[PDB]
Design a protein around this ligand. Sequence first.
Ligand SMILES: CCCCCCCCCCCCCC(=O)SCCNC(=O)CCNC(=O)[C@H](O)C(C)(C)COP(=O)(O)OP(=O)(O)OC[C@H]1O[C@@H](n2cnc3c(N)ncnc32)[C@H](O)[C@@H]1OP(=O)(O)O
Ligand SMILES: CN(C)CCCN(C)c1nc(N(C)CCC#N)c2cc(Br)ccc2n1
Ligand SMILES: [Mg+2]
Length: 411
Amino acid sequence: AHAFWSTQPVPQTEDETEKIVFAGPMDEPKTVADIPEEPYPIASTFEWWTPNMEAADDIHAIYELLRDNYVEDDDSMFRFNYSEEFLQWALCPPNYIPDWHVAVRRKADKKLLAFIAGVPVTLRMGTPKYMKVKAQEKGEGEEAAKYDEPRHICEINFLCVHKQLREKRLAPILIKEATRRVNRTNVWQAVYTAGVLLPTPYASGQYFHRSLNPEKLVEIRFSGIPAQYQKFQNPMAMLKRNYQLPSAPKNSGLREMKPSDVPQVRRILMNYLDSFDVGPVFSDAEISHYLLPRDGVVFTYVVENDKKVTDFFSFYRIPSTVIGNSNYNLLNAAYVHYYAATSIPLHQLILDLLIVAHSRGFDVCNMVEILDNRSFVEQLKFGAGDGHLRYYFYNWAYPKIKPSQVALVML
Ligand SMILES: CCCCCCCCCCCCCC(=O)SCCNC(=O)CCNC(=O)[C@H](O)C(C)(C)COP(=O)(O)OP(=O)(O)OC[C@H]1O[C@@H](n2cnc3c(N)ncnc32)[C@H](O)[C@@H]1OP(=O)(O)O
Ligand SMILES: CN(C)CCCN(C)c1nc(N(C)CCC#N)c2cc(Br)ccc2n1
Ligand SMILES: [Mg+2]
C-alpha cells in the first residue's frame, strides 16, 4: 500500500509499535562515507535549491509557497498562513545547518515547487519509564538504558508540494534528499509530526481549541453554534458570555520575559520537561531563540516574585487564510508553547495566557493534548477539535506512548 514508506526504516504496523520495548535504531549503522556525495537524481527540468534563510527574498519565496500550498483543514475552509518572520524564527534556530533546508525549483523560471525543512534538536528519546522498570523486572536494565543520553537529531517540518505537482511522487524524493543531507552530517534519526496517519506513529494527541472571539469564529464557520444554544434567542449573546475573559491578568508578578530571565526559565523548563518520556533539551542560546518575545511571532511571560522566576508560559501565533468569506480574510490563532508552573495551579497560569492572548487580539487558542495540557481542558473551556497530531521517528524503534508522555511542541 505504501510504495515509499515500505522502503523506509520506520515501523510498518501498529503491532510492530505495540510489541517494541526498547528505544534504539532500526537500520544497521552506516558511516558518512557510505552516503552518496551527489544529490539524488531529479528530472532535468527541475533543480535542487538550498534557500538562504538569511535572505529576505528566499524567505519570501518559501512564504509564498506555503501561503498557497500548505496545510488546510479537511474541508478546505482554512489554510495555515505562517508569516515570513515566523519562518525565519522556525527555520534558523542556533547552529542550524543551511543544507538541511531542501527545495525544488523549476529550472526555467526558478519557481519554487516543493520544500522540506530540517532543524537540529537535542532530544531525550530513550526507553520510556513504563517499559524501563518492566525491563528491570525482567533483568534487562542496561539494554533499556542504552540510549538514555539526549541525541542530537533532526526535526522535520514544512514539507510542501505545489498543488500543481501533487501526486507525482515528488514528496518521497524530497524526503530521500533530506535524509541524504542529514545522513551526510552524521545524523541518523529524525522526529516529525503530521495530521495524517503514516507508518507508524509512536504517539497521537487530539487538538483542542479555546474560543477567544466566538462571534468571528461563527462568522467564518470555524465554529457552528452548538445545537443546544438555540433554546434561547440571542445565542450569540450567550456564546459571547460563555467565552468572556478578564481584560487583565489575575497573577501579580506577571510580565514579559526578558534576556536576563534566560537561565532561570531554562532551569525550571528543563526540570519540568525531564519528567516526560520524549522531550527536548535546550541550551541557553536555544531558550533565548525559542522563548524570548518576538513581534508577531512568540509571546512569553514569566511570574517573577522576589526577583525569582517561578512560572512561565509561552504561545506563538499562526494565522490562517479563510478560504472564501466576504467579511474576513484571516483567523488569528495563539498556540500553547512551552510552560512551567511551580507556584500556582497550571489552570491558573494558562487562564492568564488566554487573557493575554485575548487582549492582544487572538481569535482562538489551540493546543495538542501533550505535556499537562489535559489538566486545564475542562475548566478553561477548551473543546476537542477534529483530527490529531501524530508523532513519528525516522530510524528509531520506540514503544507506543500516551501523548501526555510527550514534551516536544511542534510549530
Ligand atoms: C535521518 C534524517 C531523516 C529525515 C527525513 C525524516 C522523514 C520526513 C517525513 C516527512 C515529515 C513531514 C512532516 C510535515 O511537514 S507534515 C505537513 C505536510 N504538508 C502538508 O500536508 C501540506 C499540503 N500537502 C502537500 O503539500 C502534499 O500533499 C504532501 C507534500 C504532504 C504530499 O505530497 P503529494 O500529495 O504530492 O504525494 P506524493 O505523490 O508526492 O507522494 C506520496 C507519498 O507521500 C506520502 N505522504 C503524504 N503525506 C505525507 C506527509 N505529511 N509526511 C510524509 N509522507 C507523506 C504518502 O504516504 C505517499 O507515500 P506512500 O504511502 O506511497 O509510501
Ligand atoms: C502543534 N500543532 C498542531 C501545530 C500545528 C498548527 N497547525 C498547522 C494546525 N494543524 C491542524 N491539523 C493538521 C488538524 C488536522 C488533523 N489531523 C489543526 C487542527 C485543529 Br482541529 C486546530 C488547529 C490546528 N493547527
Ligand atoms: Mg507529487
